């Protein structure tokens, strides 16, 4: 038995044991990580962008569990299906049992003067713009749009199988301006239209657009006009405007909203800025080959027109492909960080072994995350942790190598155990604090309600801590092996002439900068630096706290960007979807908020809040009762009180779904009985019906509706909900509000607080069968916005508390700790204020980067702060010169590696990669300047001397 006396003696005597045990554990984590769990799925990027466990979120989960479980023989039904089956069997036995006594050519608009259908949001479509900035309303541009469709879409080998048809001989025509011109003037096709047809069509548009603007035109009257031989009179509009629905369809679908303004272009031809083409192929994953073959690598123009926007339904289908293809940019960042570190360390062995540890930290964390912590979900933004770890992982290797070189210089006679021990005393805590501040800022995001934010915090926080453990085990053992063996085991002719000389020139030029030049510039201009970095701090604080501010997300969740803004798919959702009338209508300009009230189901989420696929199961309330006379009386009174509130939209058209108990009372009052078959349901029954009469007659009334009327009940319709035995287990009421749907946070908060407080107060009066009712509406985006605001404040406050408390423990001096947080506050205001000026909003990844800015900013201030108190000089000027020379080079290298890793993400297609790269560049510039100039100027002017501000143990 000869085990080493201490950890420093273990690294000194047995470094190959340490590398062997680390390598064994790393390959065991790697094998189990690829073999045991199901691999990550990125086929949906918006997966997990959901609040869980919130009040609104639990009611939205419950309402979706009700809609999933409503239908024929499901948990809930709109119809008493067992009674319907028994009633039908009773009629069969009465009659049927006796009464059933025994047992390609192109489309030609002169032949086929119609399109196969109207345009719609279900068809694949592209947006055109002018290549020369002209109006699109010219014959070359019209024919260019038809030529692009024929060349890029209809030519594709799969198009013949995808296209709509009336007959096997030909595909349907595309909805395009040239084809509407070819029916209005009766040409064969777009390819045979003429300048007089374009001009005549423009005259018809100018003439008729006033009826479109005034709502008098519409899509309707051509149906009857096509039947009649003589004339049309289903409208008061001039008959020329309705000739095929052409003017309505051109204006509502094919041209931008500003082509025919009510301020009419009477002076000169209107500027058609954008036009849309619809292909007779349905949107979705069937469009993938047409896009990838004919549109992906194309430069989107023929020199007459340009394809500026595309809507094929494949944005999220391409996302997993581009997400994985763009992993080439982190790989180039690894190569550049290796190059920087090899020149800095003067060792390819220490450099390659350090990068092995960085990549291994992400492997080991994936094993811990899926196999030990048992996360069933891996967000796509967990792949961004590679960029973070490549940039920042290096930043302990530079420090430990400097401290090792200082230790070898200070004590040349020392044993390897002494050199390791002294190096670990000087490095290990500082390396921990810069690491732990950044892990804690990631882990602080585990307080978020949003599943994907919590998951990314745990994965990235864990890789940062696993990397630290390797920097104090693997890296010291690697440094000892380099010293023992590879300081012997060292185009060949020019290596002394060029390489070694250039390395020496770089070394001494850099060293003279950090020893002489940088301390001179910091100290000589300290009054300029104090004024400048204070003025930037106030400017950044005004931009984030006063005017403007960082705004909450402005698009709705299904429109969330996932690619660079220049991508046609993104340009469609963010620029063109607001400019065409059929898309404006779909976002709900006129839409009132529904007030939905549910009884008989419990508002809860029993799924795993960390798995976005686990939404639990539907929980019925066993204490519910609608059929009691007291419940019948109170629920009628509730509908009538709600309709007297200022939040209720009292339209003249009655809706007999909205309060089903009133419609049922009115139906009972119609039963003019003269036979026993109606007996319990007769109109002489007074309203609080005996419970058996209610439970019977509600089934008779619901089936009488279904037989009498061409109207159907579906999983969203208000009314009772029956189980498999036809007992009522839930009730849904719905009313329209005076509030409109909006993406604005304070307006939607006003609706929710006004309605939920009134309903909650009123429900306290309810009989015991109705006291547990709950209100729901279209509130998912408001709950996301609410959760983004809340989670950012808590995660950032937790990060600031960690940053200050470790500062005090790192440097046992209140004054140094206070100058460090003043430098860090300035860093954060200038960093976040710059992201506000760059146009960032508090969305999912942007929210996380705000708390991560705190943990990163700590690094350079702690390094310069422990070097200030380590300094042997009695005077604060000598203490600053010592701090700058002793840490300047390693801090510069930690910053440069992180900036370089961010800069490499700029060519990426994927938005999360470019945004994180922008953040990594910007936070390193601001953090390096606020630590090197501003914090060191505070120390030079009024840094402590002797025991001043020192904290006792």
């Amino acid at each position: 038995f000869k085990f080493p006396r201490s950890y420093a003696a273990l690294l000194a005597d047995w470094p190959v044991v340490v590398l062997g045990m680390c390598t064994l554990l790393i390959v065991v984590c790697a094998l189990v990580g690829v073999l045991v769990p199901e691999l990550p799925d990125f086929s949906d990027p918006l997966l997990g962008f959901e609040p869980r466990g919130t009040t609104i979120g639990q009611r939205l989960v419950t309402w979706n569990n009700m809609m999933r479980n409503t239908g024929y023989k499901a948990t809930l039904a709109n119809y008493p299906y067992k009674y319907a089956e028994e009633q039908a069997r009773s009629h069969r036995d009465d009659r049927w049992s006796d009464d059933h006594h025994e047992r390609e050519v192109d489309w030609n608009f002169q032949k086929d003067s119609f399109f196969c259908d109207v345009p719609s949001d279900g068809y694949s479509r592209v947006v055109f713009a002018s290549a020369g900035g002209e109006t699109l309303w010219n014959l070359p541009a019209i024919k260019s749009m038809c030529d692009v469709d024929n060349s890029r879409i209809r030519s594709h080998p799969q198009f013949s199988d995808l296209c709509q048809r009336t007959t096997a001989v030909s595909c349907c025509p595309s909805w395009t301006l040239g084809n509407y011109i070819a029916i209005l003037n009766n040409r064969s096709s777009c390819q045979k239209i003429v300048e007089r047809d374009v001009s005549h069509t423009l005259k018809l548009l100018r003439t008729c657009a006033k009826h479109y603007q005034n709502g008098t035109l519409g899509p309707d009257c051509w149906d009857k006009a096509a039947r009649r031989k003589d004339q049309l009179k289903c409208t008061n509009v001039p008959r020329k405007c309705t000739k095929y629905n052409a003017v309505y369809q051109i204006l509502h679908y094919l041209v931008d909203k500003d082509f025919m303004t009510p301020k009419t272009a009477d002076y000169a031809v209107p500027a058609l800025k954008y036009s849309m083409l619809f292909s007779p192929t349905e949107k979705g994953e069937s469009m993938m080959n047409i896009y990838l073959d004919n549109f992906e690598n194309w430069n989107s123009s023929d020199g007459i027109t340009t394809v500026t926007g595309i809507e094929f339904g494949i944005k999220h289908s391409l996302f997993q492909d581009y997400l994985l293809m763009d992993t080439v940019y982190p790989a180039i960042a690894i190569a550049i960080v290796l190059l920087i570190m090899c020149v800095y360390t003067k060792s390819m062995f220490i450099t390659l072994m350090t990068m092995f540890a960085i990549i291994s930290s992400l492997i080991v964390s994936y094993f811990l995350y899926r196999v030990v912590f048992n996360f069933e979900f891996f967000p796509f933004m967990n792949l961004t942790a590679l960029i973070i770890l490549v940039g920042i992982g290096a930043d302990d290797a530079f420090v430990l190598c400097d401290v090792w070189n200082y230790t070898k210089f200070d004590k040349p006679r020392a044993e390897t155990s002494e050199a390791v021990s002294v190096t670990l005393q000087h490095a290990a805590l500082s390396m921990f604090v810069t690491s732990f501040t950044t892990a804690a800022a990631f882990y602080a995001n585990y307080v978020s309600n949003i599943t994907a934010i919590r998951c990314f915090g745990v994965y990235a926080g864990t890789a940062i801590l696993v990397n630290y453990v390797l920097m104090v085990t693997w890296l010291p053992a690697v440094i000892v092996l380099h010293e023992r063996y590879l300081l012997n085991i060292f185009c060949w002719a020019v290596l002394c002439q060029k390489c070694r000389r250039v390395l020496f020139a770089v070394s001494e030029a850099s060293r003279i900068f950090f020893e002489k030049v940088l301390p001179c510039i910091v100290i000589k201009f300290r009054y300029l630096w104090l004024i400048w970095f204070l003025a930037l701090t106030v400017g950044g604080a005004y931009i984030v706290c006063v005017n403007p501010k960082m705004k909450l997300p402005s698009l709705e969740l299904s429109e969330f960007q996932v690619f660079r803004s220049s991508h046609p798919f993104e340009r469609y959702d963010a620029e063109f979807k607001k400019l065409f009338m059929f898309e404006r209508v779909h976002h709900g300009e006129e839409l009132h908020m529904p007030i939905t009230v549910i009884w008989g189901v419990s508002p809860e989420d029993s799924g795993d809040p960390l798995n976005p696929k686990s939404k639990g199961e539907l929980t019925l309330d066993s204490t519910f009762n609608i059929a009691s006379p007291a419940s019948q009386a109170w629920i009628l009174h509730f509908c009538q009180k709600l309709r007297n509130q200022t939040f209720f939209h009292q339209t003249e058209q009655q809706d007999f779904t909205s309060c089903f108990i009133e419609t049922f009372k009115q139906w009972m009052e119609n039963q003019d009985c003269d036979e026993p078959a109606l007996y319990p349901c007769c109109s002489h029954c007074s309203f609080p019906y005996k419970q058996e009469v209610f439970e019977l007659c509600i089934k008779k009334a619901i089936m009488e509706l279904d037989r009498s009327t061409g109207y159907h009940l579906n999983n969203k319709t208000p009314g009772p909900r029956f189980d498999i035995n036809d007992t009522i287990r839930a009730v849904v009421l719905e009313f329209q509000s005076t509030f409109l749907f909006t993406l604005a946070y304070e307006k939607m908060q006003q609706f929710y607080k006004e309605v939920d407080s009134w309903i909650s107060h009123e429900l306290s009066s309810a009989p015991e069968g109705l006291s547990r009712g709950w209100f729901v509406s279209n509130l998912e985006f408001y709950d996301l916005q609410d959760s983004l605001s809340d989670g950012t404040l808590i995660a950032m406050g937790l990060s600031v508390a960690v940053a200050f408390s470790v500062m005090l423990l790192t440097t046992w001096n209140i004054i140094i700790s206070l100058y460090a947080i003043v430098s860090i506050a300035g860093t954060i205001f200038v960093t976040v204020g710059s992201l506000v000026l760059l146009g960032w909003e508090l969305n999912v990844l942007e929210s996380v980067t705000i708390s991560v800015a705190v943990g990163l900013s700590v690094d350079f201030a702690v390094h310069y702060g422990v070097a200030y108190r380590l300094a042997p000089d009695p005077d604060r000027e000598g203490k600053v010169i010592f701090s700058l020379s002793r840490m300047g080079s390693a801090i510069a290298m930690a910053a440069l590696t992180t900036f370089v890793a961010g800069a490499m993400m700029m060519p990426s297609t994927v938005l999360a990669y470019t945004q994180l790269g922008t953040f990594m560049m910007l936070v390193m510039c601001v953090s390096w300047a606020f630590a090197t100039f501003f914090f060191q100027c505070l120390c030079r002017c009024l840094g402590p001397q002797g025991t001043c501000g020192q904290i006792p143990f």
Binding site: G71, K73, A84, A88, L162, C163, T166, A168, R707, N714
Partner: protein, 151 residues
């Protein structure tokens, strides 16, 4: 003025699964499937069902099929007083049709007159396409076959 169909005619003169007809088949529905919730039993008194299964499976159909079949029931009774629409297959759990069929997802129906008078069937198929079925086929002397798009 309306014209009866010929013995093997189908009115969208293209295969049933084409986008301009009843569109793509999604997959077989069985009583244990979650898509079974989306079938609806028809109880219209204007229609006669010949469910040889005695399971009631012929009443089970999707909402668009139920809408179109109820318009056809009105149309048949309006065309011939005292004649009803008849169904011999709705959704089929027998597997008696094909290896692939719109009967297996409740989007197709096999039909006759109440009276089984085969001379009316070409006019019944005409009434089907007026009632608004998305594909209609004079499939055999025993019945017309009608089907619908997915909702």
């Amino acid at each position: 003025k309306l014209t009866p169909l010929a013995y093997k005619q189908f009115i969208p003169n293209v295969a049933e699964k084409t986008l301009g007809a009843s569109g793509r088949y999604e997959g077989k529905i069985t009583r244990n499937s979650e898509r079974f919730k989306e079938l609806t039993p028809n109880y219209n008194p204007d229609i006669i069902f010949k469910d040889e299964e005695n399971t009631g499976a012929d009443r089970l159909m999707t909402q668009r099929c139920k809408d179109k079949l109820n318009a056809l029931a009105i149309s048949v009774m309006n065309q011939w007083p005292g004649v009803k629409l008849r169904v011999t297959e709705g959704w089929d759990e027998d597997g008696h049709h094909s290896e692939e069929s719109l009967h297996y997802e409740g989007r197709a129906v096999d039909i006759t007159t109440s009276d089984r008078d085969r001379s009316k069937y070409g006019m019944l198929a005409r009434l089907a396409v007026e009632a608004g079925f998305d594909w209609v086929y004079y499939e055999s002397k025993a019945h017309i076959h009608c089907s619908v798009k997915a909702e």
